[PDB]
Design a protein around this motif. Sequence first.
Motif, PDB file in Angstrom:
ATOM      1  N   UNK A  20       0.874  -1.298  -0.024  1.00 28.24           N
ATOM      2  CA  UNK A  20      -0.091  -0.002   0.012  1.00 28.24           C
ATOM      3  C   UNK A  20       0.654   1.028  -0.076  1.00 28.24           C
ATOM      4  N   UNK A  21       2.290   1.106  -0.041  1.00 30.24           N
ATOM      5  CA  UNK A  21       2.842   2.487  -0.112  1.00 30.24           C
ATOM      6  C   UNK A  21       3.667   2.312  -1.352  1.00 30.24           C
ATOM      7  N   UNK A  22       3.445   1.405  -2.161  1.00 36.71           N
ATOM      8  CA  UNK A  22       4.182   1.246  -3.592  1.00 36.71           C
ATOM      9  C   UNK A  22       3.430   2.250  -4.362  1.00 36.71           C
ATOM     10  N   UNK A  23       2.306   2.671  -4.304  1.00 32.78           N
ATOM     11  CA  UNK A  23       1.761   3.598  -5.401  1.00 32.78           C
ATOM     12  C   UNK A  23       2.588   5.218  -5.408  1.00 32.78           C
ATOM     13  N   UNK A  24       3.045   5.266  -4.143  1.00 31.20           N
ATOM     14  CA  UNK A  24       3.735   6.702  -4.008  1.00 31.20           C
ATOM     15  C   UNK A  24       4.863   6.720  -5.006  1.00 31.20           C
ATOM     16  N   UNK A  25       5.774   5.727  -5.062  1.00 32.96           N
ATOM     17  CA  UNK A  25       7.040   5.956  -6.005  1.00 32.96           C
ATOM     18  C   UNK A  25       6.711   5.273  -7.288  1.00 32.96           C
ATOM     19  N   UNK A  26       5.670   4.297  -7.534  1.00 32.70           N
ATOM     20  CA  UNK A  26       5.627   3.696  -8.884  1.00 32.70           C
ATOM     21  C   UNK A  26       4.427   4.151  -9.872  1.00 32.70           C
ATOM     22  N   UNK A  27       3.789   5.110  -9.366  1.00 33.24           N
ATOM     23  CA  UNK A  27       2.440   5.262 -10.327  1.00 33.24           C
ATOM     24  C   UNK A  27       2.644   7.034 -10.329  1.00 33.24           C
ATOM     25  N   UNK A  28       2.039   7.313 -11.692  1.00 31.64           N
ATOM     26  CA  UNK A  28       2.083   8.728 -11.898  1.00 31.64           C
ATOM     27  C   UNK A  28       1.067   9.391 -11.457  1.00 31.64           C
TER      28      UNK A  28
END
Lengths: 37, 388
Positions: B212-220
């Motif tokens: 759930x913290x991944x979207x912060x660095x991997x999503x535009x």
Amino acid sequence: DIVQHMEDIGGAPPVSCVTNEILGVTCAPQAIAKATX
Amino acid sequence: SGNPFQANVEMKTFMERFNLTHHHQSGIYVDLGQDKEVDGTLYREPAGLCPIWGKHIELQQPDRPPYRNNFLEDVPTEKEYKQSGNPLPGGFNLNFVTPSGQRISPFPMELLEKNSNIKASTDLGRCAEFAFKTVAMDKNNKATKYRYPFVYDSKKRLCHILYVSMQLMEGKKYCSVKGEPPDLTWYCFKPRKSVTENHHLIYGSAYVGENPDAFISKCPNQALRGYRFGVWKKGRCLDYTELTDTVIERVESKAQCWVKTFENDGVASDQPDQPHSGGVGRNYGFYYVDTTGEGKCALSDQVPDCLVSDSAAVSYTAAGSLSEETPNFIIPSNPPTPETALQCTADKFPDSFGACDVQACKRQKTSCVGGQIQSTSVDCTADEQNEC
Ligand SMILES: *[C@@H]1O[C@H](CO)[C@@H](O)[C@H](O)[C@H]1NC(C)=O
């Protein structure tokens, strides 16, 4: 048929209950419209 | 080559947040990327790893009570549908409750931020994690692996789980538009983004909460101000306007371009036949003012691997927000911004010029202006022009 068509566009299982790690089991308190599932 | 946007680990990591086939990996306009068995039947499941900012499902119910035309309203009870008549009233929201009557949905962020089971570092992450941590039970009351999608309402700070995973319903044999034809059980509906409305809604598959913290660095997540997306070819960054298959339209505002990156007919979509786009599609675009002062929108399916500097441009994707700045609900309680990844200092970052591309008679120029990397295509030298 209508079941295949609904499934192809994301029609969901006929489910009355879900389990959530915070709340535990959670269920519809009244019958959900059949067509919704 | 010598693509400045691929020059080092940190730059590569930065540019990778724009590649929706890399992390999101599923449809955007319609996300049905996975299949799950419940009680011996296979069902399609929203699967994408990135939240879709501004995405809502617009309904076509009659314009009258008891119909609210709002997908966030509870799914209808059989008694409600008896009272309304056709089509189905209500919305897509899961209405289930514990034995004491506590609703699973909408669920207040205020409770998620003080719960030990919830590990996510941002409010969006906590909603997504709540969704991930919710599974359908089958007819034997056993947990499955099927998970409903969610919508975060960042204005009300409420986490919604949707019982309806459908995102697009159309065809007059299946659904009515404003009660016409009146014999049909379903109203029509489709995904929308709007120039003014529902920017505060964020739609995602439950799989956004898996890490759930991944979207912060991997999503535009945010629009990118000051740059046009491009691809590195013949030694220089070509923005989408230089590409043949690019769709270019006049627009009255930047917001309309953001909406077009999501709504255009080539956006990654899993809607029928059960296509799995894998996040491939015309998902990318930018608003720019062309050399004659007209506002335009360029849309492309080419994942960006460089940027062209243009202070009046804004680059959007089908997944991201109209907003150009990081909102508070995705800043960790405890990832570099474009300003940080793109930073330079004039005396450490000299001008470079690449070789003339004699087909276009242009060359790359990379420089530092205002503490930020500039990337443009400029005229070739006089001698070089001989070769054009
Ligand atoms: C986008 O990601 C896909 C799959 O991860 C990859 O194959 C492709 O090279 C990436 N495109 C880039 C970095 O331009």
